[PDB]
Amino acid sequence: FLGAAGSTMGAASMTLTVQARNLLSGIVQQQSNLLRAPEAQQHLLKLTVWGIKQLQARVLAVERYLRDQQLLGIWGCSGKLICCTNVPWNSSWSNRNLSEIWDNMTWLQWDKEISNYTQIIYGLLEESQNQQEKNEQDLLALDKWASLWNWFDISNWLWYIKL
């Protein structure tokens, strides 16, 4: 758990060659102590201090551990720890080196890199996930001459892979 958070993303390529270095199971399974005994107590005591504080901590952890599942649902990535997107690296202005990023930079320094535009990326991702991709899938059950043979866009469709 967190065992190589200080490593660079190349040595934290080690982290995501294992279960993101056990981060998600440490998110949901560190509940197990307050899961093991909110109920082993058989005592009256006539009032409860933890009856609001533990409950607020518990449902705080649950809503935080559901917002991220819903956000992975909204970008077609539900289930998959590592998935790719159709959004390109846009005009976003931290354009830099591949062998600088995934060799010599930690995850925290990387968060300090792109602390801006993060909500821009989050708004940007679902656009290519939905507004054309879901509408293309809605097209993909019926089409005219073009679906088998449009002979125009296909070269550009090959060209997207090409450029």
Add this chain to the structure above:
Amino acid sequence: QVQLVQSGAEVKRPGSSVTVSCKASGGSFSTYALSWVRQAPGRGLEWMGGVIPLLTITNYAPRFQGRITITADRSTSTAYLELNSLRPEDTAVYYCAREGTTGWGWLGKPIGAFAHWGQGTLVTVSSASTKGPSVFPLAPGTAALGCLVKDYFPEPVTVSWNSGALTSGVHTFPAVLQSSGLYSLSSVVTVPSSSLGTQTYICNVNHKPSNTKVDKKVEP
């Protein structure tokens, strides 16, 4: 659509080898399993084996393996089949056939079925050399009559009576790979007896590699 313009039929000495082509047109020469099938001229149909041009995957025959050779040459965009040991029991029609795809096109998901096809040519070995036959009045209310195009080389001839003016009631009969090294053929029609000397029934034959197209009397 997908067009498979196969190369023409062939005559060749027996005991030698044979090559045939199948030039596709439309769709894609690669990324879809072109294949090859047989049918003896009168039998049902028979699959032999195929090729996949992007990865040269050859899925050959259960019996003809070792004697069959299929290639795929995308740089001139054709597909050849090379069989060996030509013989009277290699005589079959050889259709070249491509797998189809879902939707009206040639790019989507394939189906697994031989949807688009080619014209096919009968791959029949030759024993003898060419021969122009002779055509006869075969003598019989209703007088029967024939023009026996018998013991020729090679197949086929056609028969039309009075330059095709008589068109109804025709009954041709197919050419035979007979037991003489040559080929024979029969063809009859139905005329009355009383119109023997009035309407002269003149069959017309078309033997194109032997070059004999004669008008022939039938006045029995």
